[PDB]
Design a protein around this nucleic acid. Structure first.
Lengths: 218, 150, 206
RNA sequence: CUGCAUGGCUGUCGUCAGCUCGUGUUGUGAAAUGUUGGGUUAAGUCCCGCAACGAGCGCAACCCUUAUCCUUUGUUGCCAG
């Protein structure tokens, strides 16, 4: 939606052949996507995401690119999603049959912190070992209650989350991506128009998609 | 009455460096006892662990078969790395019979009424994958006739 | 070889000593013969007690006994005064007043003397030796330890010959001098064999 | 008489740097990959980057000790005030 007619973002003459059908012209000299088709293109994929969540498919959001590096949990705390914001490498998802040892190791802390046995000393566990749990919650807490591998993957930019696309295409996971003015759908199975470098906008956009995953509890 | 069956055991001995080391490999099958078959490879520094790894893979592997009434209707071939396992429906006598690495594979599939020979490589880790390529290759009649319009 | 005598030469290394006594060197053999005699009449009033080891100190004009037990009630008896029998069986041999201390064993299913008893009493009941051996390790390695080995001998699983078979988990430093290994050999002594078990437990250096 | 019956006692590569458990990925498989590449060290040692990770062992650390102050001793030793 465009409301008061305001338009911003990147690229003022360049666009790639794979984005050719989405762009209609330009506004504020930036290339603009057809305002008649934006909402039905967005709803089309959002309904399949809701259907995956409505058959207990677990949804993994990747927020490595700066405009989502906090908003992937700070704008989505009541959406029932899972999240990653750390830098990707080879094996960053495909090594799950090993990385489950770190999940087992996290559960071994939150099954002990709840007990009075953990509280009876001044810092030995109630500070020194809470600092150990709060450290592993930062790097693995956003996937600890998932298990196995995702049933759908979501990415903010197919240029920057390109190894999350690579690892998902190794496991066979369907990928959902945001597009604006230059994107390559190679390895992406659903596309939606939106924002990838706003300061602004992405916080509201994440709530407009992720809240349909907590509808899967119905 | 699901049964977990062993096919063969192998020992691989290697000189290092000074002295020697040796590991064992096992090949096992579990399947479902009717219309489904499944096999596992397992390698370890001791036989009971090689079999234990193999069972842990064999329970996590599956192949669906076009099977009816526990039996075959046509001759079928399956091939893997020089093993050219050819199977014929066997009747009017003993049901096993057949090559020594095939006898448990047919029985965890529920099709242990079949005469089979390897016609090439006798190595059990080739033979089992050529027998299973034949269980993947077979079809129902039913489907070989139902390819006709309407 | 390279099995050595763990209850002999290795037992004085990184461990507390089970005896301390002085004597005139012209009677050393007689005071060594009584170091066994003060145990001979005592380990018969501990016959049920699940004791891992005993310590017998003989200071001048005194004798002081410590018992390391998995079951502190069965050594103190009715009203907890029957512990004085453990003094009276050794004071009648030494001819001097005797002291008694009852010490508690931490994790009695991780102590080598008692793990070998818990396997021997299963082999007397004709259980499958690998089941008892693997359950003893899976129990001990979950109570603590850095590694453990078990070796069973005699009539294994119904065998027609004596035989020997083992099982090991983790690290067992048998060639390291500071390893603090805990050890025992046991025997079942049946009509059909001697039926033996040997156990080596490692929990930490020094 | 014989380590050519043993156990114990130690001897050696050698303070050498390398060996395993739970695992991933690749191949029909022996096995590979990682442990390769860029820098470096006493050292598969410490880093950089990367399809690999945790956990162990050895190394280092730990333990023993020496080059010199501070406090405690103070004699039949020492002797400045």
């Amino acid at each position: 939606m465009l409301k008061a007619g305001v338009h911003f973002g990147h690229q003022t003459r360049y666009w790639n052949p794979k984005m050719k059908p989405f762009i209609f012209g330009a506004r504020n000299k930036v290339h603009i996507i057809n305002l008649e088709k934006t909402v039905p293109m967005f709803n089309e994929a959002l309904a399949e995401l809701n259907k995956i969540a409505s058959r207990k498919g677990k949804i993994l959001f990747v927020g490595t690119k700066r405009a989502a590096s906090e908003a992937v949990k700070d704008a989505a705390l009541s959406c029932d999603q899972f999240f990653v914001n750390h830098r990707w490498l080879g094996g960053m998802l495909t090594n799950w049959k090993t990385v489950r040892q770190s999940i087992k190791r996290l559960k071994d802390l939150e099954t002990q912190s709840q007990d009075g046995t953990f509280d009876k000393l001044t810092k030995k566990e109630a500070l020194m070992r809470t600092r150990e749990l709060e450290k592993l919650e930062n790097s693995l807490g956003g996937i600890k209650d998932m298990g196995g591998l995702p049933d759908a993957l979501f990415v903010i930019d197919a240029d920057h989350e390109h190894i999350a696309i690579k690892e998902a295409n190794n496991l066979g996971i369907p990928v959902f991506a945001i597009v604006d003015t230059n994107s390559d759908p190679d390895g992406v199975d659903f596309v939606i128009p939106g924002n990838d470098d706003a300061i602004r906008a992405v916080t509201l956009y994440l709530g407009a998609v992720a809240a349909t995953v907590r509808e899967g509890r119905s | 009455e699901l049964q977990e069956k062993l096919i063969a055991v192998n020992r691989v001995s290697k000189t290092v460096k000074g002295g020697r080391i040796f590991s064992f490999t096992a090949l096992t099958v579990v399947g479902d006892g009717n219309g489904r078959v499944g096999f596992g490879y397992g390698k370890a520094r001791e036989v009971p662990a090689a079999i234990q790894k193999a069972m842990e893979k064999a329970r996590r592997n599956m192949i669906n078969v076009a099977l009816n009434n526990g039996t075959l209707q046509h001759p079928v071939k399956g091939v893997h790395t020089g093993s050219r396992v050819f199977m014929q429906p066997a009747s009017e006598g003993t049901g096993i019979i057949a090559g020594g690495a095939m006898r448990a594979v047919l029985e965890v599939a529920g099709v242990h009424n079949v005469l089979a020979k390897a016609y090439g490589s006798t190595n059990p880790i080739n033979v089992v994958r050529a027998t299973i390529d034949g269980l993947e290759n077979m079809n129902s009649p039913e489907m070989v006739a139902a390819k006709r319009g309407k | 070889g390279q099995k050595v005598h763990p209850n002999g030469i290795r037992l004085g290394i990184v461990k507390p000593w089970n005896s301390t006594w002085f004597a005139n060197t012209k009677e050393f053999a007689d005071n060594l013969d009584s170091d066994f005699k003060v145990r001979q009449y005592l380990t018969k009033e501990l016959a049920k007690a699940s004791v891992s080891r005993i310590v017998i100190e003989r200071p001048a004009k005194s004798i002081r006994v410590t018992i390391h037990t998995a079951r502190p009630g069965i050594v103190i008896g009715k009203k907890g005064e029957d512990v004085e029998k453990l003094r009276k069986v050794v004071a009648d041999i030494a001819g001097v007043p005797a002291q008694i201390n009852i010490a508690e064993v931490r994790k009695p299913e991780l102590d080598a003397k008692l793990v070998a008893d818990s396997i021997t009493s299963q082999l007397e009941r004709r259980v499958m030796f690998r089941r008892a051996m693997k359950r003893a390790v899976q129990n001990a390695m979950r109570l603590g330890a850095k590694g453990i080995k078990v070796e069973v001998s005699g009539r294994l699983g119904g065998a027609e010959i004596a035989r020997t078979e083992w099982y090991r988990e983790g690290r067992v430093p048998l060639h390291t001098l500071r390893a603090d290994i805990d050890y025992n050999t046991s025997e079942a002594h049946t009509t059909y064999g001697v039926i033996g078990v040997k156990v080596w437990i490692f929990k930490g250096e020094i």
